[PDB]
Design an enzyme around this catalytic site. Structure first.
Site, PDB file in Angstrom:
ATOM      1  N   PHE A  37       0.887  -1.218   0.000  1.00 31.39           N
ATOM      2  CA  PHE A  37       0.000   0.000   0.000  1.00 31.39           C
ATOM      3  C   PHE A  37       0.901   1.236   0.000  1.00 31.39           C
ATOM      4  O   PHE A  37       0.449   2.326  -0.500  1.00 31.39           O
ATOM      5  CB  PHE A  37      -0.839   0.006   1.266  1.00 31.39           C
ATOM      6  CG  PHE A  37      -1.818  -1.140   1.372  1.00 31.39           C
ATOM      7  CD1 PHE A  37      -2.070  -1.972   0.288  1.00 31.39           C
ATOM      8  CD2 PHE A  37      -2.479  -1.317   2.577  1.00 31.39           C
ATOM      9  CE1 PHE A  37      -3.068  -3.035   0.320  1.00 31.39           C
ATOM     10  CE2 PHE A  37      -3.411  -2.387   2.665  1.00 31.39           C
ATOM     11  CZ  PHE A  37      -3.691  -3.245   1.544  1.00 31.39           C
ATOM     12  N   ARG A  38       2.111   1.130   0.557  1.00 32.08           N
ATOM     13  CA  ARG A  38       3.045   2.287   0.670  1.00 32.08           C
ATOM     14  C   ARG A  38       3.906   2.464  -0.609  1.00 32.08           C
ATOM     15  O   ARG A  38       4.746   3.379  -0.633  1.00 32.08           O
ATOM     16  CB  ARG A  38       3.981   2.132   1.856  1.00 32.08           C
ATOM     17  CG  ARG A  38       3.253   2.096   3.241  1.00 32.08           C
ATOM     18  CD  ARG A  38       4.061   1.459   4.327  1.00 32.08           C
ATOM     19  NE  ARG A  38       4.252   0.023   4.041  1.00 32.08           N
ATOM     20  CZ  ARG A  38       4.853  -0.797   4.893  1.00 32.08           C
ATOM     21  NH1 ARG A  38       5.267  -0.335   6.071  1.00 32.08           N
ATOM     22  NH2 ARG A  38       4.999  -2.073   4.612  1.00 32.08           N
ATOM     23  N   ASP A 111      -5.112  -9.745   2.070  1.00 30.69           N
ATOM     24  CA  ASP A 111      -5.541 -10.274   0.827  1.00 30.69           C
ATOM     25  C   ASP A 111      -6.126 -11.669   0.878  1.00 30.69           C
ATOM     26  O   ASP A 111      -6.676 -12.175  -0.116  1.00 30.69           O
ATOM     27  CB  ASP A 111      -4.353 -10.174  -0.204  1.00 30.69           C
ATOM     28  CG  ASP A 111      -3.090 -11.036   0.235  1.00 30.69           C
ATOM     29  OD1 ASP A 111      -3.229 -12.130   0.879  1.00 30.69           O
ATOM     30  OD2 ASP A 111      -1.923 -10.558  -0.031  1.00 30.69           O
ATOM     31  N   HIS A 128      -4.542  -8.740  10.909  1.00 29.60           N
ATOM     32  CA  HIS A 128      -5.237  -7.453  10.579  1.00 29.60           C
ATOM     33  C   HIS A 128      -6.612  -7.796  10.030  1.00 29.60           C
ATOM     34  O   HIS A 128      -7.256  -6.915   9.379  1.00 29.60           O
ATOM     35  CB  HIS A 128      -4.457  -6.652   9.517  1.00 29.60           C
ATOM     36  CG  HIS A 128      -3.131  -6.125   9.984  1.00 29.60           C
ATOM     37  ND1 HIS A 128      -2.935  -5.375  11.134  1.00 29.60           N
ATOM     38  CD2 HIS A 128      -1.907  -6.271   9.429  1.00 29.60           C
ATOM     39  CE1 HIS A 128      -1.656  -5.017  11.216  1.00 29.60           C
ATOM     40  NE2 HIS A 128      -1.009  -5.620  10.235  1.00 29.60           N
ATOM     41  N   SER A 201       9.918  -7.141   7.326  1.00 30.17           N
ATOM     42  CA  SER A 201      11.039  -7.123   8.322  1.00 30.17           C
ATOM     43  C   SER A 201      10.562  -7.024   9.759  1.00 30.17           C
ATOM     44  O   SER A 201      11.377  -6.928  10.716  1.00 30.17           O
ATOM     45  CB  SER A 201      11.949  -5.967   7.999  1.00 30.17           C
ATOM     46  OG  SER A 201      11.084  -4.878   8.211  1.00 30.17           O
TER      47      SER A 201
END
Ligand SMILES: CCNC(=O)c1ccc(C(=O)NCCC2CCN(c3ncnc4cc(C(N)=O)sc34)CC2)s1
Ligand SMILES: [Zn+2]
Length: 274
Positions: A37-38, A111, A128, A201
């Site tokens: 998303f980033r 996803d 999430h 990470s």
């Protein structure tokens, strides 16, 4: 240590590692066609216009969602099962499970591709949340994700048949607690005999601390673009890094394991079914 990737493949082939805990993040699903998303340019948070967002965080904020649920539901229609396909990383984890070696897979992704790849829900901590189920925002009635599928695909905001509230897919939004299943970590981390970290990470808490929660001699194998985050800040003598492209890292481990042909067959069967 100093262990190599081959040393770890040998311990897996010997079945000396049979309680593997796996942690995965965004880096495993970019080959399926979902950018982080980033990511500049291509990532959700840089494409405010196609979602109709006033700033990027709004897509996972509860007050915005109540004001206007359509941006989130555009994302839901894109990410709902059946649009993206798992890749070899996900099929590797499916094979780990079919062989009896996966204790738990903790995923930061929403996803849902671990479940699509056929790993059972009981093996997953979708930290999430997930599109696989939804909840009424008003009365808390749960729904199977399939039950709001037609609305999602037809751009209708699904409604609860009891109270008429909006029904929201079970993605954990900003400021909400993690799912109760997250606290399986208390039982799983002391018990892991091999910690495998793919495509993340683990810089963000509460995930970051979990990397230190395995016992002193447990190998931690990172397959990730770079060695950063807590495994870099505090290395242990049985850590292994396989850097660069995560698909190549995982294809390399699959070959050392002698699973390449078994992977080819699994991917054929599954992408058949899809
Ligand atoms: C401590 C108590 N609560 C929390 O720490 C949090 C609750 C909610 C949080 C949150 O970030 N919610 C929004 C969902 C996240 C999903 C993973 N995420 C991603 N970021 C970048 N790329 C990707 C790719 C993803 C994919 N391919 O599915 S998910 C994701 C950030 C938003 S964080
Ligand atoms: Zn309701």
């Amino acid at each position: 240590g100093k262990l190599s990737l081959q040393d770890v493949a040998e311990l897996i082939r010997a079945r000396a590692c049979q309680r593997v805990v796996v942690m995965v993040g965004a880096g495993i699903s970019t080959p399926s066609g979902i950018p982080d998303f980033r990511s500049p340019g291509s990532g959700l948070y840089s494409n405010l216009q196609q979602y109709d967002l006033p700033y990027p965080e709004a897509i996972f904020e509860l007050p915005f969602f109540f004001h206007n649920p359509k941006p989130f539901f555009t994302l839901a229609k894109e990410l709902y099962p059946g649009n993206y396909k798992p890749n070899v990383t996900h099929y590797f984890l499916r094979l780990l499970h079919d062989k009896g070696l996966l204790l738990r897979l903790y995923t930061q992704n929403i996803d849902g591709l671990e479940r699509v790849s056929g790993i059972p829900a009981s093996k997953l901590v979708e930290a999430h949340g997930t599109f696989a189920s939804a909840t009424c925002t008003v009365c808390q009635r749960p729904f199977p994700g399939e039950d709001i599928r037609a609305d999602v695909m037809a751009d209708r905001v699904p409604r609860c048949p009891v109270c008429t509230g909006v029904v929201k897919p079970d993605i954990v939004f900003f400021g909400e607690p993690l799912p109760q299943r997250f606290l399986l970590h208390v039982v799983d981390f002391p018990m892991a005999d091999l910690l495998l970290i793919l495509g993340t990470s683990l810089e963000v808490e509460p995930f970051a601390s979990l990397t230190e929660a395995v016992r002193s001699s447990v190998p931690r194998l990172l397959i990730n673009r770079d060695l950063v985050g807590p495994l870099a800040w505090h290395p242990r003598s049985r850590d292994v890094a396989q850097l660069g492209d995560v698909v190549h890292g995982v294809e390399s481990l699959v070959e050392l394991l002698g699973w390449t042909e078994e992977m080819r067959d699994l991917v054929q069967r599954e992408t058949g079914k899809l």
